[PDB]
Amino acid sequence: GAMEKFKTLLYDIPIECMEVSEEIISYAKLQLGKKLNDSIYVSLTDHINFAIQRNQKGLDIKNALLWETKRLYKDEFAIGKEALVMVKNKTGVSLPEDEAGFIALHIVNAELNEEMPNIINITKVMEEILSIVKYHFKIEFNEESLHYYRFVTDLKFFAQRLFNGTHMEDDFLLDTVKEKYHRAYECTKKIQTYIEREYEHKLTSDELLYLTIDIERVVK
Amino acid sequence: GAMEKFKTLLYDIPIECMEVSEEIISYAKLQLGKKLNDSIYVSLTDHINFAIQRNQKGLDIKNALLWETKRLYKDEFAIGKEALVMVKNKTGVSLPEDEAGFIALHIVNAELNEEMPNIINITKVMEEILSIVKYHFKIEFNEESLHYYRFVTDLKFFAQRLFNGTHMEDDFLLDTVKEKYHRAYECTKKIQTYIEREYEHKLTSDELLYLTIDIERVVK
């Protein structure tokens, strides 16, 4: 049919692919405890089928977002890791960890129809800090610059740490930027105080250093 | 059917969803010039359908990997951005940029059956630098630590810059870490020389600073 490709997989689907897809999703539902978009069954059936085909032809894939996925979508990644074990059990094929990341993203997609609290929290703090810098210097960001990319990535790092409750050193590296980049540091202090008072969270010396350099790079 | 969910979408698919899916994929193929897994038609039909449903019920989604996607999958993200325009043209709905990121990842998935040169290059350089640090200190990395996460993220940043040919300041921030973290800096110098000689690429003062701090944090 001319419209078959929009709604169904266009090939003879191996039963084993459907079996492992169901096994993975059953485990995902057990761990997450939330409803998942039924299309996850289609997406994983197809994904595992071609993941195996790639491995069989000697193509070892690489996932550019592997580490960020592991950190930001910890629960989905854990399921993705177990999924690779299930695939090995079913087919005898050992897929690279990179595939656990892609499986994790398929699960995230199936979860998009309900709010994701941790993501909302992290993005909220990022927005708040960006707002402080914009207002302090009365500037608009060049969101295409590599410096802005570094800045926003650092802010996500900070926000993640804040909501993970992870507790951590040496101010020697900060005392130096304080002198040369004093204007940027004035804003760093405002952010430090805001975060400590609003979230009872203390940024580390390293975070304050990165924040100061980031502000200097993006504002100048 | 008991197996329908593994191969087809389980609902009355709006014709408009298939229409915009085809429009987006036609453009993706025009821009990328490569073959795409036919399942991309199913994935995007379903994705846009629920993306619109989310918007209509007041759920504004957030994409935790938005910036990394924009940077690492530039071409796919550009298509994702244009896709949001096509969706607006078809339905009158303006989706958040976050959705452009998810659309980009669906495209990346459809491209996984052929090598992706840029990704291979970036990951190769990351591996080479990690190898230098491991061999220099005769250590094994605690890949679960936040310090390792920062380290590997920085390495990807460096590698991306290297293959993007992006040219950029002040060594004052490096002269300081040279004294306190001298052992780490000895390794920073080896990496700097390796990258300059092997790739004709010069790391910046900022990159050398981050690299030195990263090594100190991960080794100690």
Short mmCIF file of C-alpha atoms in Angstrom, two decimals:
data_model
loop_
_atom_site.label_atom_id
_atom_site.label_comp_id
_atom_site.label_asym_id
_atom_site.label_seq_id
_atom_site.Cartn_x
_atom_site.Cartn_y
_atom_site.Cartn_z
CA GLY A 1 0.00 0.00 0.00
CA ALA A 2 1.00 3.60 -0.71
CA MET A 3 0.42 4.47 2.94
CA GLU A 4 1.73 1.31 4.58
CA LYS A 5 5.13 2.85 5.33
CA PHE A 6 3.51 5.50 7.55
CA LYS A 7 1.91 2.98 9.88
CA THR A 8 3.70 -0.36 9.70
CA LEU A 9 7.14 -1.91 9.35
CA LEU A 10 7.74 -2.90 5.71
CA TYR A 11 9.42 -6.30 6.04
CA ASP A 12 9.06 -9.80 7.44
CA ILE A 13 9.50 -9.13 11.15
CA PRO A 14 11.46 -11.87 12.95
CA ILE A 15 9.42 -13.22 15.86
CA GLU A 16 12.48 -12.98 18.12
CA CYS A 17 12.57 -9.21 17.62
CA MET A 18 9.00 -8.87 18.89
CA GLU A 19 9.78 -11.22 21.77
CA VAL A 20 12.78 -9.24 23.03
CA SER A 21 10.95 -5.94 22.42
CA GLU A 22 8.13 -7.10 24.69
CA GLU A 23 10.62 -8.35 27.30
CA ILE A 24 12.44 -5.00 27.37
CA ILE A 25 9.25 -2.97 27.58
CA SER A 26 7.80 -5.23 30.28
CA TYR A 27 10.93 -4.50 32.35
CA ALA A 28 10.78 -0.78 31.54
CA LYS A 29 7.19 -0.62 32.79
CA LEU A 30 8.19 -2.54 35.93
CA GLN A 31 11.00 -0.09 36.71
CA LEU A 32 9.35 3.19 35.69
CA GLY A 33 5.82 2.36 36.80
CA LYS A 34 4.33 4.67 34.19
CA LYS A 35 2.22 4.26 31.08
CA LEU A 36 4.22 4.18 27.85
CA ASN A 37 3.12 5.14 24.34
CA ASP A 38 2.25 1.82 22.62
CA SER A 39 4.43 2.81 19.67
CA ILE A 40 7.39 1.84 21.85
CA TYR A 41 6.67 -1.76 20.85
CA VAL A 42 7.10 -0.86 17.17
CA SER A 43 10.15 1.34 17.72
CA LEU A 44 12.04 -1.24 19.77
CA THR A 45 11.10 -4.17 17.51
CA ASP A 46 12.56 -2.27 14.56
CA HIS A 47 15.51 -0.88 16.50
CA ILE A 48 16.72 -4.23 17.79
CA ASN A 49 16.23 -5.84 14.38
CA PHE A 50 18.56 -3.37 12.69
CA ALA A 51 20.92 -3.12 15.66
CA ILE A 52 21.53 -6.84 15.22
CA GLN A 53 21.83 -6.48 11.43
CA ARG A 54 24.46 -3.77 11.88
CA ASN A 55 26.47 -5.91 14.29
CA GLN A 56 26.26 -8.86 11.89
CA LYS A 57 27.70 -6.90 8.97
CA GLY A 58 30.56 -5.50 11.02
CA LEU A 59 29.17 -2.03 11.62
CA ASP A 60 29.90 -0.99 15.20
CA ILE A 61 27.82 2.11 15.89
CA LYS A 62 28.79 5.11 17.98
CA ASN A 63 26.39 7.21 20.06
CA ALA A 64 27.44 10.88 20.28
CA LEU A 65 25.09 11.49 23.21
CA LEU A 66 25.95 8.36 25.21
CA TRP A 67 27.34 10.04 28.34
CA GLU A 68 24.74 12.79 28.47
CA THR A 69 22.03 10.14 28.17
CA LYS A 70 23.56 8.11 31.00
CA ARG A 71 23.61 11.20 33.22
CA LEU A 72 20.32 12.90 32.35
CA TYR A 73 18.17 9.81 31.76
CA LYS A 74 19.66 7.49 34.38
CA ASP A 75 16.59 5.26 34.77
CA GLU A 76 16.00 4.87 31.05
CA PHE A 77 19.69 4.14 30.49
CA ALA A 78 19.69 1.45 33.19
CA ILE A 79 16.83 -0.21 31.32
CA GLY A 80 18.77 0.17 28.07
CA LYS A 81 21.76 -1.57 29.64
CA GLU A 82 19.62 -4.48 30.82
CA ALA A 83 18.07 -4.54 27.35
CA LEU A 84 21.46 -5.40 25.84
CA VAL A 85 21.65 -8.36 28.21
CA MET A 86 18.22 -9.55 27.07
CA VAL A 87 19.30 -9.19 23.44
CA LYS A 88 22.42 -11.27 24.11
CA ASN A 89 20.29 -13.92 25.85
CA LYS A 90 17.91 -14.09 22.88
CA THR A 91 20.32 -13.88 19.95
CA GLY A 92 23.82 -14.45 21.31
CA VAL A 93 24.80 -11.01 20.02
CA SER A 94 26.61 -8.54 22.31
CA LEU A 95 25.71 -4.98 21.27
CA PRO A 96 27.89 -2.00 22.20
CA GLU A 97 26.85 0.20 25.14
CA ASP A 98 26.07 2.87 22.54
CA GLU A 99 22.90 0.93 21.72
CA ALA A 100 21.76 1.13 25.35
CA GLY A 101 21.72 4.89 24.85
CA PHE A 102 19.51 4.72 21.76
CA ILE A 103 17.15 2.29 23.48
CA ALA A 104 16.98 4.72 26.41
CA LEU A 105 15.92 7.54 24.08
CA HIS A 106 13.16 5.40 22.57
CA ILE A 107 11.86 4.90 26.11
CA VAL A 108 12.08 8.63 26.83
CA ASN A 109 10.01 9.30 23.72
CA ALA A 110 7.35 6.90 24.99
CA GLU A 111 7.28 8.87 28.27
CA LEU A 112 6.82 12.32 26.71
CA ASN A 113 3.05 12.46 27.19
CA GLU A 114 3.34 13.11 30.93
CA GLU A 115 5.47 15.68 32.77
CA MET A 116 9.02 14.71 33.71
CA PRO A 117 9.69 16.50 37.05
CA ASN A 118 13.48 16.20 37.09
CA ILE A 119 13.78 17.68 33.61
CA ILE A 120 11.45 20.54 34.49
CA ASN A 121 13.50 21.29 37.62
CA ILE A 122 16.84 21.27 35.83
CA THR A 123 15.64 23.46 32.98
CA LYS A 124 14.00 25.90 35.42
CA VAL A 125 17.26 26.52 37.29
CA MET A 126 19.15 26.93 34.01
CA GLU A 127 16.62 29.54 32.88
CA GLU A 128 16.86 31.38 36.19
CA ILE A 129 20.65 31.66 36.01
CA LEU A 130 20.57 32.73 32.35
CA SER A 131 18.03 35.39 33.34
CA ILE A 132 20.35 36.74 36.04
CA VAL A 133 23.25 37.12 33.62
CA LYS A 134 21.10 38.73 30.91
CA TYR A 135 19.68 41.26 33.37
CA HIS A 136 23.02 42.00 35.03
CA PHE A 137 24.78 42.98 31.81
CA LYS A 138 21.73 44.09 29.81
CA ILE A 139 22.69 41.82 26.93
CA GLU A 140 21.28 39.29 24.49
CA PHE A 141 23.13 36.00 24.03
CA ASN A 142 24.76 34.83 20.80
CA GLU A 143 23.23 31.37 21.19
CA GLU A 144 25.23 30.09 18.21
CA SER A 145 28.66 30.70 19.73
CA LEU A 146 30.73 27.87 21.17
CA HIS A 147 31.09 29.95 24.33
CA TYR A 148 27.32 30.00 24.82
CA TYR A 149 27.24 26.24 24.24
CA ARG A 150 29.82 25.72 26.98
CA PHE A 151 27.95 28.10 29.29
CA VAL A 152 24.56 26.40 28.95
CA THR A 153 26.15 22.95 29.24
CA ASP A 154 27.82 24.03 32.50
CA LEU A 155 24.52 25.38 33.81
CA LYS A 156 22.86 22.02 33.17
CA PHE A 157 25.77 20.34 35.00
CA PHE A 158 25.23 22.64 37.98
CA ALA A 159 21.47 22.13 38.00
CA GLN A 160 21.81 18.35 37.75
CA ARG A 161 24.18 18.29 40.75
CA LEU A 162 21.74 20.49 42.67
CA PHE A 163 18.82 18.09 42.25
CA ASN A 164 20.96 14.96 42.68
CA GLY A 165 21.95 16.08 46.16
CA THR A 166 25.53 15.11 45.35
CA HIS A 167 27.96 16.66 47.83
CA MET A 168 31.63 17.26 47.04
CA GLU A 169 37.87 21.97 47.39
CA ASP A 170 40.56 24.57 46.70
CA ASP A 171 39.77 28.24 46.07
CA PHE A 172 43.22 28.95 44.62
CA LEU A 173 41.82 28.62 41.11
CA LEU A 174 39.05 31.10 41.89
CA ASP A 175 41.12 33.77 43.64
CA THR A 176 42.90 34.33 40.33
CA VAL A 177 39.90 34.84 38.04
CA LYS A 178 38.49 37.20 40.70
CA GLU A 179 41.12 39.79 39.80
CA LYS A 180 41.25 39.67 36.01
CA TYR A 181 37.56 38.95 35.40
CA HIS A 182 36.19 41.07 38.24
CA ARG A 183 33.09 42.24 36.35
CA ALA A 184 32.13 38.67 35.50
CA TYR A 185 32.83 37.59 39.08
CA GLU A 186 30.42 40.23 40.40
CA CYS A 187 27.69 38.34 38.54
CA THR A 188 29.08 34.98 39.69
CA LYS A 189 28.58 36.15 43.27
CA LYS A 190 24.97 37.15 42.60
CA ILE A 191 24.26 33.71 41.13
CA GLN A 192 26.05 31.98 44.01
CA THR A 193 23.94 33.86 46.55
CA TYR A 194 20.70 33.27 44.63
CA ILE A 195 21.28 29.53 44.40
CA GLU A 196 22.30 29.21 48.06
CA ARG A 197 19.31 31.20 49.31
CA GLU A 198 16.67 29.82 46.94
CA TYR A 199 17.80 26.18 46.80
CA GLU A 200 19.97 25.79 49.94
CA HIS A 201 22.69 24.70 47.54
CA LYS A 202 26.34 25.75 47.63
CA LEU A 203 28.27 25.85 44.35
CA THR A 204 31.81 24.47 44.54
CA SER A 205 35.04 26.33 43.79
CA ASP A 206 35.27 24.52 40.44
CA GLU A 207 31.71 25.45 39.50
CA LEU A 208 32.32 29.09 40.45
CA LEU A 209 35.48 29.10 38.32
CA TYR A 210 33.68 27.71 35.27
CA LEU A 211 30.78 30.08 35.78
CA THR A 212 33.07 33.11 35.95
CA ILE A 213 35.00 32.14 32.83
CA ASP A 214 31.75 31.34 31.00
CA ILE A 215 30.26 34.74 31.83
CA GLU A 216 33.43 36.53 30.72
CA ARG A 217 33.49 34.61 27.42
CA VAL A 218 29.81 35.15 26.62
CA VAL A 219 29.57 38.79 27.68
CA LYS A 220 32.81 40.02 26.11
CA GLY B 1 -4.34 -8.66 16.97
CA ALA B 2 -2.05 -9.78 19.79
CA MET B 3 0.97 -8.81 17.70
CA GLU B 4 -0.36 -5.67 16.05
CA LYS B 5 1.35 -3.36 18.56
CA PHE B 6 4.79 -4.65 17.51
CA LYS B 7 4.35 -3.66 13.88
CA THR B 8 1.71 -0.96 13.51
CA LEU B 9 0.34 2.15 15.18
CA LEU B 10 -2.76 1.26 17.22
CA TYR B 11 -5.11 4.14 16.46
CA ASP B 12 -6.88 6.05 13.70
CA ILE B 13 -3.96 7.90 12.14
CA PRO B 14 -4.86 11.45 11.02
CA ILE B 15 -4.03 11.89 7.33
CA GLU B 16 -2.35 15.22 8.11
CA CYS B 17 0.20 13.43 10.30
CA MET B 18 1.24 11.19 7.41
CA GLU B 19 1.33 14.19 5.08
CA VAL B 20 3.68 16.24 7.25
CA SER B 21 5.79 13.15 8.04
CA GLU B 22 6.33 12.60 4.32
CA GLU B 23 7.10 16.30 3.79
CA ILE B 24 9.72 16.30 6.56
CA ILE B 25 11.36 13.10 5.36
CA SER B 26 11.38 14.28 1.74
CA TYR B 27 13.31 17.36 2.91
CA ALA B 28 15.61 15.26 5.10
CA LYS B 29 16.51 13.07 2.13
CA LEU B 30 17.09 16.18 0.00
CA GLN B 31 19.50 17.66 2.56
CA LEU B 32 21.31 14.51 3.68
CA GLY B 33 21.36 12.72 0.34
CA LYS B 34 21.41 9.32 2.03
CA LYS B 35 19.06 6.37 2.29
CA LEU B 36 16.93 6.36 5.44
CA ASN B 37 15.37 3.40 7.25
CA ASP B 38 11.72 3.31 6.07
CA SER B 39 10.59 3.11 9.70
CA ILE B 40 11.30 6.84 9.86
CA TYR B 41 7.90 7.34 8.22
CA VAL B 42 6.20 5.49 11.09
CA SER B 43 8.27 7.14 13.82
CA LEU B 44 7.66 10.68 12.59
CA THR B 45 3.95 10.11 11.87
CA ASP B 46 3.51 8.97 15.47
CA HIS B 47 5.86 11.58 16.92
CA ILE B 48 4.15 14.56 15.32
CA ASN B 49 0.71 13.21 16.21
CA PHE B 50 1.53 13.10 19.91
CA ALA B 51 3.67 16.24 19.82
CA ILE B 52 0.56 18.08 18.67
CA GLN B 53 -1.62 16.31 21.25
CA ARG B 54 0.77 17.38 24.01
CA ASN B 55 0.72 20.99 22.86
CA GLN B 56 -3.08 20.92 22.69
CA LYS B 57 -3.47 19.76 26.29
CA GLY B 58 -1.04 22.35 27.63
CA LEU B 59 1.98 20.10 28.07
CA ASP B 60 5.10 21.95 26.95
CA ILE B 61 7.88 19.39 26.71
CA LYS B 62 11.53 19.87 27.58
CA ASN B 63 14.45 18.15 25.83
CA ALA B 64 17.41 17.50 28.17
CA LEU B 65 19.74 16.88 25.23
CA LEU B 66 18.66 19.84 23.09
CA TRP B 67 21.98 21.71 22.98
CA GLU B 68 24.13 18.62 22.56
CA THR B 69 21.88 17.54 19.69
CA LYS B 70 22.19 20.96 18.03
CA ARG B 71 25.98 20.76 18.27
CA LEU B 72 26.67 17.10 17.48
CA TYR B 73 23.92 16.49 14.92
CA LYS B 74 23.86 19.89 13.22
CA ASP B 75 22.38 18.70 9.92
CA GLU B 76 19.66 16.60 11.53
CA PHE B 77 18.79 19.45 13.89
CA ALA B 78 18.49 21.91 11.00
CA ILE B 79 15.97 19.52 9.43
CA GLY B 80 14.19 19.25 12.77
CA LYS B 81 13.91 23.04 12.94
CA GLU B 82 12.44 23.23 9.44
CA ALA B 83 10.12 20.38 10.44
CA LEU B 84 8.53 22.59 13.11
CA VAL B 85 7.81 25.16 10.40
CA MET B 86 6.13 22.49 8.26
CA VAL B 87 4.07 21.39 11.26
CA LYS B 88 2.95 24.98 11.87
CA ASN B 89 2.03 25.34 8.18
CA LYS B 90 -0.05 22.15 8.30
CA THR B 91 -1.76 22.46 11.68
CA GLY B 92 -1.27 26.04 12.87
CA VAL B 93 0.53 24.68 15.94
CA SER B 94 3.91 26.13 16.97
CA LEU B 95 5.94 23.43 18.73
CA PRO B 96 8.84 24.27 21.06
CA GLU B 97 12.40 23.97 19.73
CA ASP B 98 12.75 20.97 22.05
CA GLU B 99 10.70 18.98 19.53
CA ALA B 100 13.19 19.80 16.77
CA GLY B 101 15.74 17.92 18.87
CA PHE B 102 13.58 14.81 19.16
CA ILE B 103 12.81 14.88 15.44
CA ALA B 104 16.56 15.14 14.80
CA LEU B 105 17.19 12.00 16.86
CA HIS B 106 14.55 10.08 14.91
CA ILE B 107 16.44 11.02 11.75
CA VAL B 108 19.76 9.95 13.29
CA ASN B 109 18.23 6.57 14.10
CA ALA B 110 17.18 6.18 10.46
CA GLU B 111 20.82 6.89 9.46
CA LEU B 112 22.43 4.31 11.75
CA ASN B 113 22.80 1.62 9.10
CA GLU B 114 25.72 3.38 7.42
CA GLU B 115 28.89 4.80 8.98
CA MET B 116 28.80 8.38 10.25
CA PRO B 117 32.34 9.76 9.60
CA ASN B 118 32.18 12.79 11.89
CA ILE B 119 31.06 10.70 14.84
CA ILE B 120 33.78 8.13 14.21
CA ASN B 121 36.40 10.90 14.07
CA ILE B 122 35.26 12.58 17.27
CA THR B 123 35.08 9.33 19.23
CA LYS B 124 38.49 8.24 17.93
CA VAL B 125 40.22 11.37 19.25
CA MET B 126 38.43 11.04 22.59
CA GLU B 127 39.65 7.45 22.89
CA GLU B 128 43.21 8.46 22.00
CA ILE B 129 43.35 11.14 24.70
CA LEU B 130 41.79 8.84 27.31
CA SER B 131 44.43 6.25 26.39
CA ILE B 132 47.23 8.76 26.97
CA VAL B 133 45.98 9.63 30.45
CA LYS B 134 45.43 5.98 31.43
CA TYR B 135 48.94 5.02 30.30
CA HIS B 136 50.61 8.06 31.85
CA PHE B 137 49.30 7.42 35.36
CA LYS B 138 48.81 3.65 35.09
CA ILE B 139 45.23 3.94 36.29
CA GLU B 140 41.71 2.75 35.57
CA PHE B 141 38.92 5.34 35.44
CA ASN B 142 35.95 5.50 37.81
CA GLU B 143 33.55 6.00 34.91
CA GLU B 144 30.67 6.62 37.32
CA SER B 145 32.17 9.72 38.95
CA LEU B 146 30.96 13.20 38.07
CA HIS B 147 34.60 14.13 37.47
CA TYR B 148 34.91 11.47 34.77
CA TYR B 149 31.67 12.73 33.22
CA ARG B 150 33.08 16.25 33.03
CA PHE B 151 36.36 14.94 31.63
CA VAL B 152 34.81 12.92 28.80
CA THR B 153 32.39 15.75 27.98
CA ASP B 154 35.34 18.15 27.68
CA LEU B 155 37.18 15.69 25.43
CA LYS B 156 34.18 15.55 23.09
CA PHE B 157 34.12 19.38 23.09
CA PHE B 158 37.80 19.44 22.12
CA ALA B 159 37.38 16.80 19.42
CA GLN B 160 34.34 18.54 17.94
CA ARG B 161 36.27 21.84 17.69
CA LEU B 162 39.15 19.98 16.06
CA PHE B 163 37.02 18.58 13.25
CA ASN B 164 34.94 21.74 12.86
CA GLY B 165 38.06 23.72 12.00
CA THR B 166 36.84 26.47 14.33
CA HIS B 167 39.66 28.87 15.20
CA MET B 168 39.65 31.02 18.33
CA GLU B 169 43.53 33.94 24.46
CA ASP B 170 45.09 34.55 27.88
CA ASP B 171 47.47 32.07 29.52
CA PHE B 172 47.12 33.69 32.95
CA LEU B 173 44.57 31.06 33.94
CA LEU B 174 46.94 28.27 32.90
CA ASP B 175 50.13 29.56 34.51
CA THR B 176 48.43 29.07 37.89
CA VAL B 177 47.30 25.44 37.53
CA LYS B 178 50.81 24.66 36.21
CA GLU B 179 52.23 25.12 39.70
CA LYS B 180 49.68 23.43 41.95
CA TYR B 181 48.70 20.62 39.57
CA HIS B 182 52.14 20.06 38.04
CA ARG B 183 51.76 16.27 37.72
CA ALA B 184 48.49 16.65 35.85
CA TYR B 185 49.99 19.39 33.68
CA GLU B 186 52.83 17.08 32.64
CA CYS B 187 50.16 14.90 31.04
CA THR B 188 48.35 17.94 29.62
CA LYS B 189 51.56 18.81 27.78
CA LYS B 190 51.84 15.30 26.32
CA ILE B 191 48.27 15.51 25.04
CA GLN B 192 48.83 19.02 23.67
CA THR B 193 51.88 17.86 21.73
CA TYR B 194 50.16 14.70 20.47
CA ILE B 195 47.16 16.62 19.15
CA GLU B 196 49.30 19.32 17.53
CA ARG B 197 51.59 16.80 15.82
CA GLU B 198 48.97 14.22 14.83
CA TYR B 199 46.12 16.57 13.86
CA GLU B 200 47.88 19.92 13.24
CA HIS B 201 45.53 21.29 15.87
CA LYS B 202 46.43 23.67 18.70
CA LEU B 203 44.40 23.49 21.91
CA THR B 204 43.52 26.87 23.43
CA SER B 205 44.49 28.17 26.87
CA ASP B 206 40.94 27.49 28.09
CA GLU B 207 41.00 23.91 26.79
CA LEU B 208 44.40 23.30 28.40
CA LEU B 209 43.06 24.65 31.70
CA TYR B 210 40.00 22.39 31.65
CA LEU B 211 42.11 19.42 30.62
CA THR B 212 44.56 19.96 33.49
CA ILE B 213 41.81 20.32 36.09
CA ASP B 214 39.98 17.29 34.66
CA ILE B 215 43.09 15.11 34.88
CA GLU B 216 43.78 16.23 38.45
CA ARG B 217 40.18 15.48 39.48
CA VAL B 218 40.02 12.05 37.83
CA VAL B 219 43.49 10.83 38.83
CA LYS B 220 43.44 12.01 42.45
#
